[PDB]
Amino acid sequence: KAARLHEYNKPLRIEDVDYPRLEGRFDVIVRIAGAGVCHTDLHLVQGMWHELLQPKLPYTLGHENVGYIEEVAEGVEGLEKGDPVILHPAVTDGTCLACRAGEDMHCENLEFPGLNIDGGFAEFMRTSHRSVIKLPKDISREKLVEMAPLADAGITAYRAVKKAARTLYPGAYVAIVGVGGLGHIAVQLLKVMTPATVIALDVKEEKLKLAERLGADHVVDARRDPVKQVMELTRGRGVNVAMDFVGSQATVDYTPYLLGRMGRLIIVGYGGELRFPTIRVISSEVSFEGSLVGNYVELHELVTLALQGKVRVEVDIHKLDEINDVLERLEKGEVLGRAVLIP
Amino acid sequence: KAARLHEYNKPLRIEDVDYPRLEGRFDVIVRIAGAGVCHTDLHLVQGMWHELLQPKLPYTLGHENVGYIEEVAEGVEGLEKGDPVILHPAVTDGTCLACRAGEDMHCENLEFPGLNIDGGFAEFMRTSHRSVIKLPKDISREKLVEMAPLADAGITAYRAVKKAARTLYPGAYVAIVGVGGLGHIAVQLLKVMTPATVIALDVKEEKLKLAERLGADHVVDARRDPVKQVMELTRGRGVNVAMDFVGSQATVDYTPYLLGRMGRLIIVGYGGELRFPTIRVISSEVSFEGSLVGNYVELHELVTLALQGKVRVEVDIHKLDEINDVLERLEKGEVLGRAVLIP
Amino acid sequence: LKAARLHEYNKPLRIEDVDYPRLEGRFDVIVRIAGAGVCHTDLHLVQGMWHELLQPKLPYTLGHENVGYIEEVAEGVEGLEKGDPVILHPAVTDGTCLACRAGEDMHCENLEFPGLNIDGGFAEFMRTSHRSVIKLPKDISREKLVEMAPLADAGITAYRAVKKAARTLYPGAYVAIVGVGGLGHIAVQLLKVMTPATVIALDVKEEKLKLAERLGADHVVDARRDPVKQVMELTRGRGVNVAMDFVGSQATVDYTPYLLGRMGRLIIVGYGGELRFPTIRVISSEVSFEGSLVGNYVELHELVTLALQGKVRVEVDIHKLDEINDVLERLEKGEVLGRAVLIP
Amino acid sequence: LKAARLHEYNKPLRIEDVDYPRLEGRFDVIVRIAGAGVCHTDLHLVQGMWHELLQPKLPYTLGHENVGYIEEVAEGVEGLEKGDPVILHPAVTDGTCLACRAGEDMHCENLEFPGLNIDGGFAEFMRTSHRSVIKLPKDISREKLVEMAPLADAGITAYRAVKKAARTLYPGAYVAIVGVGGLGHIAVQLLKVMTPATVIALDVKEEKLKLAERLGADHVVDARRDPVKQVMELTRGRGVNVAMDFVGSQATVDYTPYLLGRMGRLIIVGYGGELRFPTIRVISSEVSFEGSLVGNYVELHELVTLALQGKVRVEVDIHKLDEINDVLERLEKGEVLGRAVLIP
Ligand SMILES: NC(=O)c1ccc[n+]([C@@H]2O[C@H](COP(=O)([O-])OP(=O)([O-])OC[C@H]3O[C@@H](n4cnc5c(N)[nH+]cnc54)[C@H](O)[C@@H]3O)[C@@H](O)[C@H]2O)c1
Ligand SMILES: NC(=O)c1ccc[n+]([C@@H]2O[C@H](COP(=O)([O-])OP(=O)([O-])OC[C@H]3O[C@@H](n4cnc5c(N)[nH+]cnc54)[C@H](O)[C@@H]3O)[C@@H](O)[C@H]2O)c1
Ligand SMILES: NC(=O)c1ccc[n+]([C@@H]2O[C@H](COP(=O)([O-])OP(=O)([O-])OC[C@H]3O[C@@H](n4cnc5c(N)[nH+]cnc54)[C@H](O)[C@@H]3O)[C@@H](O)[C@H]2O)c1
Ligand SMILES: NC(=O)c1ccc[n+]([C@@H]2O[C@H](COP(=O)([O-])OP(=O)([O-])OC[C@H]3O[C@@H](n4cnc5c(N)[nH+]cnc54)[C@H](O)[C@@H]3O)[C@@H](O)[C@H]2O)c1
Ligand SMILES: CCCCCCCC(=O)O
Ligand SMILES: CCCCCCCC(=O)O
Ligand SMILES: CCCCCCCC(=O)O
Ligand SMILES: CCCCCCCC(=O)O
Ligand SMILES: [Zn+2]
Ligand SMILES: [Zn+2]
Ligand SMILES: [Zn+2]
Ligand SMILES: [Zn+2]
Ligand SMILES: [Zn+2]
Ligand SMILES: [Zn+2]
Ligand SMILES: [Zn+2]
Ligand SMILES: [Zn+2]
Ligand SMILES: [Zn+2]
Ligand SMILES: [Zn+2]
Fold first, then answer.
1. Domain identity same for A130 and A170
2. Gene3D superfamilies given for it (chains A, B) (predicted)?
3. Ligand 2 center to residue B33 CA distance, Å?
4. CB–CB of A339/A326 below 8 Å?
5. Would the annotation count C7 as a binding residue?
């Protein structure tokens, strides 16, 4: 069984696929325990990545994966059948210069299960041993599934929060915009990784309440003049860092206007077009900084935090065959935190 | 005598003004030796700063100034009549937190001679002692005048090149876009301050030749598909840093498309609106970073470089009463390097 | 006009009358002292450790960790009036030299330092510069003000040092904080607030190890008992990513470099001991030894913010000014839990 | 199958036959050596300085600064075939541990180092990992290839150290580069290419001071003659922003910390001597002492780029392999101008 995109703007088809083949850079087959559903999956179905990615249809979605080793190629070391694992979403060579510098997402021969090739919305998936991080041998299936969103939502929030932390200090304000699958993790990470005052923005009451439970110092309903609210909270100074974990035209429109002098907007969500006068860029000396997933070391560090119990994903557990219900709900803002699908 | 903006989109009026008053934060009067003409002066006349600055008309323009001390308030130390000086363009308190951190342009009570108040297109100007940098006692009037553009064009290029250098390395490419008053200085500074391969872009043949004389490794005529040219020079990888020292809609349109993976666009020129899809911001993991003039330490470091003979401004010397001819020429692209006006 | 003054090295301070401070020049603020912290540097001062380097005129009043209330101000001083509660940055600087223009108060060319080389805060009143003043909330209680006194030197020093540490700490990294003293017990709290590192605190007194436990250390180690071996066991032989010496004795300067793992960094804050380490080990582990000196004005402001947020709190032992010599004796013996603060 | 091998410490290397290297496991490349640089570390090795730390099996072939031509490769190795000119990073690493995944080759858990602890390049052939190989332009002349040999250890070490230096250098800052040796003469060039600092070069031989002058040093200083006082005069008593010890003797380790100005940084590259400096000076000047260890693969690639651009060039003294012991004698005596490189 697998959930596959045959056509854009249609439901995924839940159907039988062949067992994955060990081949080429794919030397590990994982039995999926939990597969996170990302807003990127909505964008994928919508066709947003067609131009840039040009993938062969059909293919199985799912790029946020935990599971157990099923089978490995001869020569793969340190991995036996049954070993619990989390998967970095990039499959990379380790040979090009970016890889030699540790930047997995900038590797010249990158493949990405669930984005441009078959992913984890399936009973089994192939990946590379270089993408595997081993989890404690005794981890419970329940705890393992709970960690699935660390593989994409969490690692992306973590790298972005690392960026943020560089200019945050006590008394600094950070606006975290969008308390969603990524953003609710970022609220937690901002509190663990910086001493900054955290202002969380969203447009559903239950998500604002989730942000408070997770440590946000202030919450702002962005349906009601978010710039004015944030300017009030910051005594007209604006925020030192804003982080857009939504990426809609709406948020990309207003988030640059949250920034104070030498303010930085970390752009994580996508879909909208950035439009901002350069005279403001220079007169405020602000920056707009993309952040992309994260690297292997960053996933290892985030897994450590989770194992220490310092970050915990809010997870809504569903079955693989419920994927279309879950995607519909995610489009409508009806998923609190992160949905994760299980076989 | 002084050149003053009475009305927007009109020539400046060359007329008699009163001698400046020592008052408030203005405890130094300088006899102007050289006053640089900046493209910002065109933007000022056009009204671009009216909304953000709301200054009282008329006022004298000119924010790129060198001269000799004429008079100082009692209590001003280390400054006598006749001392040659260069002026940092910001007049600041030194008391707010930004100032205590060394960031003059982020000072909460900033004034800026020639931008929002009377400047240096005049025989005399008032400023603060905190804005003064003393030059060698024996400097010739000729050499002093040659240094005038360091006070704004140069310090702005220098801070921006400091930003650039942070991710440049041997084999890295930097595109420097606009070999103008600021940009021709930036070509020199890129070669002194980084080991990067410098690609200079402009749209007048003589400016491309100036860039070659100043050390550009490659030059590109941006009237002929600059993105394609730069992609060819960089074997489809793009540039590690692009620097926009033009700020027109034209350049803001194309400069983000010069960037390679983890590429950074340093935005210096202004006037255009930045418009770029977030899906590209994240998929390339690029950033867009404003740079604003520079701080007092940065001006001191740049003055050192000039005194070492490691940067030299290309200067077109004119009389104060020729200001309107010079502004017309600057609008039309007829000034090689930087015009400087003398009494 | 009572003050505690150093007249001779290796003798008790003299508690005596002195004239009221002169409001003049760069000394454009006089403060009525509310709380004056006692630092291990004060023992070093009395021992004569700073004579060679600072060559101060004797006698002078000690005390460089000060909070109080404005008494009066000179012309041109803005936003300060009699009664305003304040905490003082220990450096008195010009604001004109290049260091000052870059924001590094401790590297100002014309630096004077109340309590170190000129009269300080172990007195009813003390002169300083408005540039050294940070205003506290007008409503603060005297008790809370006094409890903040150690932030002015112990706290700011620990905070700058922890900022240095944080630059290479990450989840799963270990930091050894050595010396849970006046500075060190603050550093334990700051390492938890400012980094995600696993915190191992070392000391030689049981009550200081318990203090570190209450303040959030993940592990504590009694350094009378083979500290390097204990730290190597805790880190599975990898050593620590950052060690921080908040003691500075020969004993600690000798063992702390050996706590470091590969690319490890020793932040040296305490002083008195001589660093001695083979360069072959410096390069083969690629380690660094980095001094840290008090901190700058912005750093004191950030730290005051953390304190007002309730995220850092100093363990204080309050005594009267005229108990100064008894307190210095206790401090030399390791009998002050946290920081002693003197009040009028 | 000729090689220069260490059998006993404090004796000449033995020039003898050895079997051709075994292509196996992580050793998936064999190179025909074209040029093998001789490092001061080779004198330290023969002296037994590394025995304690590395505990290598004797005998083994020295030489860790190598260029050559691919001879053969094992399965799975891409983009390399017999005859390709190459320069070798001196570390042989797995690419799997966390250090490797972060790009720090020198901190890889399973690190092996040809010439230091296993057989090296003072031989006709040497085994290594494809991960250590950087391909040079196919057209390069043998003469130019050999001249690049020192970039593999002397150059990369100077380059990483200069990267560290550059982080706090600015126009008007001074850098003292101490030891215009095999590493140091490269560092002089790199300081000019990579920073805007004023470069003061120190050595104890006239010909090395002239070399530094030709390579662009702004000032040179004969360190037999009160180097600290001469540097203090050059800097108007401020000292240097960065000092770089490319000697590592007790003599230099003793004086180089005293070159530092406020917030100054000593980059320790040379080794052999013991660092000994008062902590009161470490904190009162807020100085740091920072080791630097060879460099990573990306850094070797950047340095090779600078060399191919003509922006750095090594001063080489070319000798035959079987002159190794005469060359080591000259090096111990300070009689090698630049870097000695051995050829077949
Ligand atoms: N850059 C990357 O590496 C990366 C990786 C993964 C996901 N993404 C993108 O990141 C974004 C977030 O993904 P996700 O967390 O799965 O989505 P999500 O779980 O659907 O969360 C989006 C959140 O935004 C909230 N929201 C909607 N409109 C507004 C508004 N106007 N103001 C404030 N909040 C609003 C919404 O209620 C929800 O909580 C999407 O654009 C993803 O495609 C980026
Ligand atoms: N951010 C700051 O602190 C700051 C300070 C000073 C000036 N400015 C701005 O910086 C910009 C440059 O000022 P300046 O150097 O005085 O102006 P300038 O001397 O008029 O130079 C502009 C240069 O851009 C070239 N140019 C025009 N169009 C293009 C094009 N399409 N592609 C490539 N090159 C082109 C032009 O030929 C000229 O050499 C202006 O927008 C100024 O207002 C910014
Ligand atoms: N660099 C600076 O800016 C700066 C500023 C202030 C103070 N200092 C110095 O910093 C050091 C700490 O000052 P303080 O906090 O006032 O001193 P303190 O309060 O006396 O604390 C010293 C602590 O070290 C503990 N200790 C003693 N020996 C050992 C040992 N072998 N191993 C582990 N712990 C031990 C001791 O029990 C006590 O808790 C002193 O050297 C001060 O002079 C430095
Ligand atoms: N950290 C590392 O990764 C690394 C790597 C390679 C070599 N090394 C070491 O770095 C040092 C330099 O190696 P090398 O360049 O091969 O040595 P070298 O070529 O023998 O150069 C040493 C230089 O120091 C000069 N010198 C000697 N005494 C003094 C003095 N008192 N003051 C100033 N100059 C003096 C000497 O004349 C010569 O020019 C040695 O200790 C090597 O073992 C370190
Ligand atoms: C926030 C102040 C903006 C200053 C504009 C400076 C432009 C120039 O110097 O040409
Ligand atoms: C350059 C590759 C782009 C990767 C897109 C990742 C989005 C996600 O993980 O949701
Ligand atoms: C633990 C690794 C030590 C490597 C020492 C390198 C010295 C040299 O390259 O000359
Ligand atoms: C050269 C300045 C030295 C200042 C030493 C500060 C020690 C302390 O604050 O306890
Ligand atoms: Zn995703
Ligand atoms: Zn790669
Ligand atoms: Zn549910
Ligand atoms: Zn200007
Ligand atoms: Zn200010
Ligand atoms: Zn002319
Ligand atoms: Zn103290
Ligand atoms: Zn100063
Ligand atoms: Zn070597
Ligand atoms: Zn490794």
1. no
2. Medium-chain alcohol dehydrogenases, catalytic domain, NAD(P)-binding Rossmann-like Domain
3. 24
4. yes
5. no
Same domain, yes or no, for C187 and C132?
no
Return d(Cα D9, Cα C337) in angstroms, integer. Answer: 54
Q: Which of B94, B101, B295 sits opposite C298 (nearest CB)?
A: B101
> Which residues, including other chains, have CB under 8 Å from residue C167's CB and lie 6 or more apart?
none
* A172, A191 Cβ separation under 8 angstroms: no
What residue spans of chain B are helical by DSSP H? Answer: 39-46, 50-53, 97-100, 141-146, 153-165, 181-193, 205-213, 226-233, 249-254, 278-284, 296-307, 323-331
Instruction: Determine what percent of chain B falls in helix, strand and coil, rounding each to the nearest 5.
Output: 35, 25, 40
Distance CA A83, CA B215 (A): 58
* Helix/strand/coil for B313: coil
Q: How would DSSP label each residue in C271-330?
A: -SSEEEEEHHHHHHTT-EEEE--S--HHHHHHHHHHHHTTS----EEEEEGGGHHHHHHH
Q: Which residue has the tokens 């630049």?
A: D338
Indicate whether D143 and D15 sit together in one domain: yes
Peptide linkage before B58 cis (omega within 30 of 0): yes
Q: What is the nearest CA distance from A100 to chain D, expressed in angstroms?
A: 5
Q: Using the beta-carbon criterion (under 8 Å), do B302 and D194 form an inter-chain contact? A: no
Q: Residue A148's domain is classified under what CATH number? A: 3.90.180.10
Smallest CA-to-CA distance from B341 within B320, B321, B324 is with B320
Q: Determine the Cα angle at B331 with ends B325 and B336, to 5°.
A: 80
Instruction: Give the start-end residues of each E strand in chain D.
Output: 2-6, 14-17, 29-38, 60-61, 66-73, 85-88, 125-128, 133-135, 174-178, 198-203, 219-222, 240-245, 260-268, 274-278, 288-291, 316-320, 339-343
DSSP 8-state symbol, C103:
T
**Do B58 and B117 lie in a common domain?**
yes
Long-range contacts of A93-102 (CB under 8 A, 24+ apart): A93/A25, A94/A130, A94/D95, A95/D78, A97/D298, A97/D301, A98/B261, A100/D103, A100/D296, A100/D297, A100/D298, A101/D103, A101/D298, A102/A295, A102/A296, A102/A297, A102/D101, A102/D102, A102/D103
**Together in a domain, A25 and A120:** yes
Domain count, chain B: 2
| Same structural domain, D14 and D48 | yes
Tokens coding C33:
């002292």
Binary contact (B297, C102; C-beta < 8 A)? yes
Same-domain check for residues D13 and D127 = yes
Using a CB–CB cutoff of 8 Å, tell me whether A262 touches chain D. Answer: no
**Same domain, yes or no: A30 and A136:** yes
- Which atom in ligand 1 lies closest to the alpha carbon of residue A40? 43
CATH of the domain at D195: 3.40.50.720
Go through C172-184 and write b for each residue having 16 or more CB atoms within 10 A of its CB, e for each that does not: bbbbbbbbbbbbb
CB of B152 shorter than 6 A to ligand 5? yes
The number of residues making up chain B comes to: 343
A140 Cβ neighbours under 8 A, 6+ residues apart: none
**C261 assigned to a ligand binding site:** no
The upper half-sphere exposure of residue C245, i.e. CA atoms within 13 Å in the direction of its Cβ, equals 33
Helix B181-193 vs helix B153-165: crossing angle, to nearest 10: 40
Token pair belonging to B50 = 């009216």
C49 touches chain D (CB under 8 A): yes
Method underlying the structure: X-ray
* Backbone φ, ψ for residue D212 (5° rounding): -60, -40
Which of C293, C314, C329 is the endpoint of a domain?
Answer: C293
Name the closest ligand to CA B322: 14
User: Residue C17: which residues within 8 A CB-CB, separation 6 or more?
Assistant: C1, C2, C3
Q: What is the CA(C43)–ligand 5 centre distance, in A?
A: 52
- What range defines the domain where residue A181 resides? 153-292
| CA separation for the pair B245, A282 (Å, rounded) | 12
Burial class (CB in 10 A: 0-12, 13-18, 19+), A105: buried
